[PDB]
XYZ file of C-alpha atoms in Angstrom:
429
model
C 21.889 -20.286 -11.411
C 18.985 -22.853 -11.835
C 16.650 -20.722 -9.523
C 13.470 -19.131 -11.101
C 14.015 -15.764 -12.849
C 11.735 -12.988 -14.047
C 12.033 -12.264 -17.773
C 10.498 -8.909 -18.756
C 8.796 -8.509 -22.102
C 7.006 -5.394 -23.340
C 5.417 -3.895 -26.428
C 2.905 -1.269 -27.697
C -0.193 -3.548 -27.861
C -1.383 -7.009 -26.654
C -0.969 -8.376 -30.238
C 2.490 -6.865 -30.649
C 3.474 -8.222 -27.183
C 2.441 -11.731 -28.431
C 4.472 -11.251 -31.608
C 7.499 -10.219 -29.502
C 6.935 -13.303 -27.255
C 6.874 -15.618 -30.314
C 9.956 -13.968 -31.891
C 11.838 -14.247 -28.547
C 10.760 -17.933 -27.999
C 12.077 -18.886 -31.448
C 15.412 -17.104 -30.640
C 15.738 -18.623 -27.127
C 14.966 -22.076 -28.556
C 17.657 -21.670 -31.224
C 20.327 -20.214 -28.886
C 19.579 -21.960 -25.551
C 22.877 -23.835 -25.564
C 24.793 -20.498 -26.023
C 22.931 -18.102 -23.751
C 22.944 -18.083 -19.946
C 19.481 -17.534 -18.364
C 20.973 -14.881 -16.088
C 22.374 -12.871 -18.999
C 19.105 -12.947 -20.937
C 17.105 -11.898 -17.822
C 19.592 -9.024 -17.211
C 19.395 -7.979 -20.928
C 15.572 -7.959 -20.967
C 15.354 -5.848 -17.760
C 18.347 -3.513 -17.992
C 19.136 -3.600 -21.732
C 15.643 -2.866 -23.057
C 13.628 0.357 -22.908
C 10.356 -0.818 -21.307
C 7.380 -0.173 -23.607
C 3.744 0.617 -22.422
C 2.209 -2.878 -22.564
C 4.214 -5.090 -20.139
C 4.407 -8.676 -18.906
C 7.053 -10.965 -17.335
C 7.490 -14.721 -17.597
C 8.880 -16.663 -14.609
C 11.219 -19.600 -15.500
C 14.097 -21.621 -13.946
C 15.504 -22.742 -17.312
C 15.497 -21.564 -20.968
C 13.157 -24.430 -22.200
C 10.745 -23.416 -19.397
C 10.908 -19.791 -20.674
C 10.196 -20.960 -24.283
C 7.024 -22.652 -22.906
C 5.964 -19.532 -21.002
C 6.695 -17.242 -23.958
C 4.820 -19.530 -26.396
C 1.923 -19.710 -23.909
C 1.739 -15.866 -23.977
C 2.109 -15.794 -27.827
C -0.636 -18.362 -28.398
C -3.107 -16.927 -25.853
C -5.680 -14.119 -26.056
C -5.020 -12.195 -22.871
C -5.559 -8.449 -22.684
C -2.486 -6.776 -21.223
C -3.293 -3.503 -19.521
C -0.917 -0.620 -20.392
C 1.317 1.023 -17.779
C -0.246 4.126 -16.162
C 3.089 5.583 -15.023
C 5.871 6.707 -17.361
C 8.814 5.322 -15.283
C 9.653 8.884 -14.149
C 8.018 8.780 -10.683
C 8.217 6.165 -8.006
C 5.161 4.497 -6.499
C 3.088 6.246 -3.827
C 3.074 3.960 -0.800
C -0.364 3.920 0.879
C -0.373 3.027 4.596
C -3.918 2.193 5.731
C -5.273 2.039 9.372
C -6.438 -0.871 11.574
C -8.486 -3.786 10.244
C -5.997 -5.244 7.789
C -4.673 -7.855 10.370
C -5.006 -11.608 9.839
C -3.677 -14.830 11.536
C 0.051 -15.561 10.885
C 0.217 -12.599 8.462
C 3.996 -12.275 8.909
C 5.038 -15.951 8.775
C 5.808 -16.335 5.011
C 7.540 -12.961 4.741
C 9.740 -13.639 7.788
C 10.952 -16.792 5.987
C 11.102 -15.524 2.358
C 12.252 -11.878 2.850
C 15.359 -11.280 4.964
C 14.882 -7.513 5.047
C 11.320 -8.095 6.422
C 12.828 -10.300 9.163
C 15.599 -7.750 9.918
C 13.016 -4.945 10.244
C 10.815 -7.035 12.553
C 13.968 -7.851 14.634
C 14.703 -4.095 15.076
C 11.119 -3.474 16.249
C 10.905 -6.548 18.504
C 12.702 -5.090 21.608
C 11.080 -1.639 21.160
C 7.498 -3.051 21.018
C 8.386 -5.421 23.872
C 9.605 -2.511 26.076
C 6.752 -0.149 25.057
C 3.697 -2.453 24.849
C 4.810 -5.575 26.754
C 4.420 -8.226 24.044
C 6.341 -10.008 21.298
C 5.434 -8.605 17.866
C 7.048 -11.730 16.246
C 4.764 -14.030 18.314
C 1.759 -11.814 17.422
C 2.282 -11.841 13.605
C 3.046 -15.611 13.497
C 0.372 -16.936 15.974
C -2.445 -19.228 14.776
C -5.001 -16.612 16.011
C -5.260 -13.048 14.542
C -3.840 -10.285 16.791
C -6.633 -8.688 18.947
C -6.779 -5.638 21.327
C -5.997 -2.083 20.102
C -2.695 -2.094 22.082
C -1.513 -5.231 20.135
C -3.193 -4.662 16.746
C -1.686 -1.182 16.057
C 2.003 -2.078 16.797
C 1.597 -5.401 14.839
C 0.032 -3.775 11.710
C 2.582 -0.875 11.870
C 5.409 -3.471 12.107
C 4.163 -5.268 8.914
C 3.756 -1.911 7.112
C 7.304 -0.724 7.802
C 8.880 -4.167 7.089
C 7.062 -4.222 3.693
C 8.468 -0.744 2.716
C 12.027 -1.607 3.849
C 11.872 -4.885 1.816
C 10.643 -3.032 -1.294
C 13.422 -0.463 -1.100
C 16.355 -2.586 0.154
C 15.676 -5.841 -1.744
C 13.706 -4.686 -4.828
C 15.194 -1.156 -5.430
C 11.735 0.534 -5.244
C 12.234 4.045 -3.652
C 8.819 5.656 -3.089
C 7.834 8.687 -5.097
C 5.604 9.841 -2.220
C 3.843 8.406 0.926
C 0.184 8.746 2.058
C -1.029 7.539 5.470
C -4.545 7.042 6.852
C -5.032 7.191 10.658
C -2.276 4.951 12.367
C -0.913 4.449 8.813
C 0.715 7.849 9.253
C 3.319 6.408 11.692
C 4.624 4.082 8.940
C 4.293 6.977 6.421
C 6.470 9.153 8.734
C 9.239 6.421 9.059
C 9.264 5.820 5.267
C 9.327 9.590 4.564
C 12.139 10.221 7.069
C 9.956 12.412 9.353
C 10.497 10.057 12.349
C 13.033 7.349 13.188
C 11.747 3.687 13.094
C 11.923 3.665 16.922
C 10.134 7.009 17.504
C 7.331 5.961 15.141
C 7.055 2.642 17.047
C 6.904 4.645 20.303
C 4.037 6.775 18.755
C 2.011 3.744 17.733
C 2.693 1.863 21.073
C 1.867 4.718 23.390
C -1.142 5.947 21.480
C -2.717 2.419 21.351
C -2.129 1.873 25.116
C -3.968 5.155 25.903
C -6.823 4.149 23.607
C -7.481 1.005 25.710
C -8.867 3.356 28.415
C -11.671 4.505 26.020
C -12.389 1.058 24.440
C -16.059 0.455 23.840
C -17.091 4.153 23.711
C -18.765 4.813 20.327
C -19.069 3.208 16.826
C -18.165 3.937 13.161
C -19.920 3.510 9.783
C -18.955 3.763 6.097
C -21.432 5.375 3.638
C -21.131 5.823 -0.161
C -22.095 9.548 0.042
C -19.772 12.605 -0.181
C -18.835 14.240 3.158
C -20.545 17.585 2.364
C -23.810 15.642 1.889
C -23.292 13.576 5.059
C -22.651 16.758 7.123
C -25.761 18.385 5.647
C -27.869 15.367 6.758
C -26.388 15.438 10.300
C -27.138 19.153 10.640
C -30.621 18.749 9.134
C -31.439 15.943 11.630
C -30.001 17.961 14.606
C -27.317 15.344 15.304
C -24.323 16.476 17.393
C -23.174 13.076 18.780
C -22.016 11.717 15.346
C -19.485 13.567 13.014
C -17.581 12.942 9.725
C -14.476 10.977 10.859
C -12.904 10.068 7.483
C -13.257 11.497 3.935
C -12.012 8.498 1.897
C -13.058 9.434 -1.598
C -15.199 12.034 -3.421
C -18.064 9.526 -3.028
C -17.175 7.787 0.302
C -17.406 8.950 3.973
C -16.872 7.352 7.433
C -18.958 8.727 10.326
C -18.164 8.206 14.005
C -19.851 8.879 17.311
C -22.373 7.280 19.707
C -23.152 3.607 18.961
C -26.954 3.865 18.523
C -27.013 6.976 16.277
C -24.325 5.515 13.985
C -26.274 2.239 13.598
C -29.555 4.194 13.084
C -27.978 6.249 10.295
C -26.610 3.099 8.549
C -30.031 1.387 8.692
C -31.708 4.575 7.215
C -29.085 4.870 4.389
C -29.573 1.214 3.412
C -33.371 1.806 3.297
C -32.697 4.603 0.692
C -30.587 2.094 -1.378
C -27.345 3.863 -0.297
C -24.467 1.497 0.367
C -23.748 1.781 4.131
C -21.800 -0.717 6.453
C -20.924 -0.569 10.235
C -17.146 -0.620 10.727
C -15.732 -2.891 13.457
C -14.255 -0.527 16.068
C -13.602 -0.467 19.840
C -13.276 3.396 19.834
C -14.986 6.033 17.613
C -11.787 7.822 16.476
C -11.566 11.210 14.717
C -14.543 12.383 16.799
C -14.928 13.966 20.301
C -14.911 10.358 21.738
C -11.044 10.568 21.785
C -10.970 13.943 23.646
C -10.276 12.504 27.191
C -6.953 10.854 26.224
C -5.498 13.727 24.101
C -3.703 15.538 26.970
C -2.080 12.278 28.142
C -1.003 11.514 24.544
C 0.636 14.946 24.138
C 2.619 14.272 27.363
C 3.646 10.734 26.227
C 4.975 12.066 22.901
C 6.727 15.207 24.314
C 10.148 13.486 23.696
C 9.369 12.316 20.054
C 11.966 14.013 17.742
C 10.503 15.054 14.354
C 12.656 15.555 11.219
C 12.074 17.219 7.838
C 10.530 14.693 5.407
C 12.963 13.446 2.724
C 10.054 12.183 0.483
C 6.775 13.996 -0.572
C 4.374 13.338 2.320
C 0.700 13.843 1.524
C -0.922 14.582 4.917
C -4.410 13.382 5.742
C -4.179 15.233 9.166
C -3.244 18.752 7.941
C -5.747 21.016 6.135
C -3.299 21.206 3.149
C -1.943 17.774 2.186
C 0.856 19.439 0.193
C 2.070 21.067 3.480
C 4.975 19.057 4.982
C 4.322 17.721 8.475
C 6.143 18.495 11.701
C 5.594 15.048 13.248
C 5.728 16.137 16.896
C 3.324 15.100 19.721
C 0.841 17.749 18.549
C 0.746 16.178 15.068
C -0.099 12.744 16.503
C -2.801 14.169 18.748
C -4.328 15.954 15.669
C -3.921 12.776 13.626
C -6.177 10.892 16.128
C -8.729 13.702 16.642
C -9.033 15.420 13.229
C -11.024 13.987 10.284
C -8.839 11.726 8.034
C -8.737 13.822 4.821
C -7.526 10.811 2.796
C -9.320 11.772 -0.469
C -7.761 15.271 -0.434
C -4.263 13.754 0.115
C -4.719 11.165 -2.740
C -6.147 13.916 -4.972
C -3.138 16.186 -4.278
C -0.684 13.340 -5.212
C -2.653 12.624 -8.392
C -2.796 16.339 -9.326
C 1.020 16.414 -8.825
C 1.449 13.556 -11.338
C 1.566 10.333 -9.334
C -0.416 7.508 -11.031
C 0.938 4.313 -9.357
C -0.221 3.642 -5.763
C 0.611 0.522 -3.770
C -0.859 -0.226 -0.371
C 1.818 -1.602 1.965
C -0.470 -3.313 4.476
C -1.473 -6.906 5.495
C -4.670 -6.632 3.331
C -6.031 -3.805 1.079
C -8.441 -1.384 2.855
C -8.061 1.731 0.606
C -7.552 0.423 -2.980
C -11.177 1.282 -3.924
C -10.823 4.722 -2.311
C -7.720 5.470 -4.522
C -9.556 4.183 -7.658
C -12.614 6.335 -6.860
C -10.404 9.486 -6.622
C -8.662 8.654 -9.939
C -12.044 8.150 -11.670
C -13.272 11.542 -10.312
C -10.178 13.285 -11.799
C -10.625 11.322 -15.142
C -7.192 9.772 -14.670
C -5.857 6.304 -15.322
C -4.296 5.200 -12.047
C -3.088 1.875 -10.628
C -4.034 0.970 -7.030
C -2.044 -2.107 -6.057
C -2.171 -4.230 -2.900
C 1.179 -5.220 -1.258
C -0.396 -8.285 0.309
C -3.779 -9.988 0.797
C -5.240 -12.058 3.589
C -4.198 -15.770 3.253
C -2.243 -15.102 0.029
C 0.690 -17.464 -0.505
C 3.980 -15.569 -0.855
C 6.484 -18.339 -1.789
C 8.677 -15.812 -3.638
C 8.115 -12.985 -1.146
C 7.357 -9.614 -2.636
C 8.681 -10.439 -6.151
C 5.021 -10.410 -7.325
C 4.462 -6.834 -6.079
C 7.706 -5.779 -7.851
C 6.311 -7.312 -11.118
C 3.001 -5.467 -10.684
C 4.814 -2.154 -9.964
C 6.915 -2.706 -13.142
C 3.806 -3.601 -15.230
C 2.080 -0.424 -13.923
C 4.996 1.860 -14.879
C 6.446 2.844 -11.523
C 10.028 4.129 -11.583
C 12.370 1.573 -10.018
C 16.120 0.667 -9.818
C 16.488 -2.423 -12.077
C 20.079 -2.973 -10.795
C 18.651 -4.227 -7.457
C 16.852 -7.223 -8.976
C 19.400 -7.707 -11.924
C 22.703 -6.519 -10.367
C 25.098 -7.864 -13.082
C 25.290 -9.801 -16.392
C 26.017 -9.569 -20.134
C 24.084 -7.809 -22.863
C 23.034 -10.640 -25.192
C 22.155 -10.140 -28.879
C 18.490 -11.013 -28.234
C 16.009 -9.666 -30.841
C 14.990 -6.021 -30.813
C 11.393 -5.719 -31.988
C 10.720 -2.959 -34.647
C 9.586 0.469 -33.231
C 5.884 -0.436 -33.982
């Protein structure tokens, strides 16, 4: 009962939120000997209709909360308004490779039991399929390397993050969007594949890709894909193609190593933001053609299911179409262009405004923001975790940011029981 709690506080403006903080601090200070911290936290979260401008104060005791509330009330912070209306859940974004960092899973294995349980389920599957310990990989002092180790390790973090958010924090996703290998975690979370079949997909596909390691390169350019394709055709280039369409202004090309690096050098000379992407294989190009028949054969036993959650496909030519996640889908997922911008745009057109990337480090937050900006919409693109970020209280911070942003969530998961206290009710203004 003397453990730190999250006290939610909301209003219609930053000034009104400070007035509510001051009014609450005066009340808590006067009634601290009568009110239990658990009851007041329960009342603020489940007994109040959350207003547009939100915040939360963390405190282990009522005098600590009066300090935090008075700190808010005295300050001059600008509290951003929620972009969601609490009607739709968050859209989980599952990015590709490149998010991995050394001992990325250590703090979450200790602080989040559902993260540890999910990693325990995957441990024997990844061991049987890829021949390594995923727990050793995500807790080692050196970052996981080798496509056959990276993909199962990043997928394992992605799925353990989503299970923790739903099981511990009562956050059911409104929709899922995957990018490249991110689609295996998107399929588990959407109910299209079982945890095990999705692990099999990511294990098998990464083992086959080791055969073509070193063949080709990739590059990111801040130009729309129609423009990039026009330039490739104009220059007579057939060895480099558009591999990813990330945003209405961003494109990833892939193909032979020299031509990709030549194009990046040329774009930078025209003051166009261009960067080589660190890759062993040039995916979503003809470089992956040799291993596609073997992949189809490896995934012939994978059992797809009808998605239970809206699944915005970056593989299909219509993201609103619901995937049949069979072996053919995973072959197309590796070979076809990642139509990530089209998938994000479809979700935004359908009303989703809160996006959270469940990955070891954010790779597609800027892409999501760029699509929102193009549609003239106010969206939130959150990061589930960041490289070397302390997580002493697990994912409680991400829950707070989802709440502040206006994502629909089950408040009875974080505040399961308590008493409605006669705490002040600020006027409607």
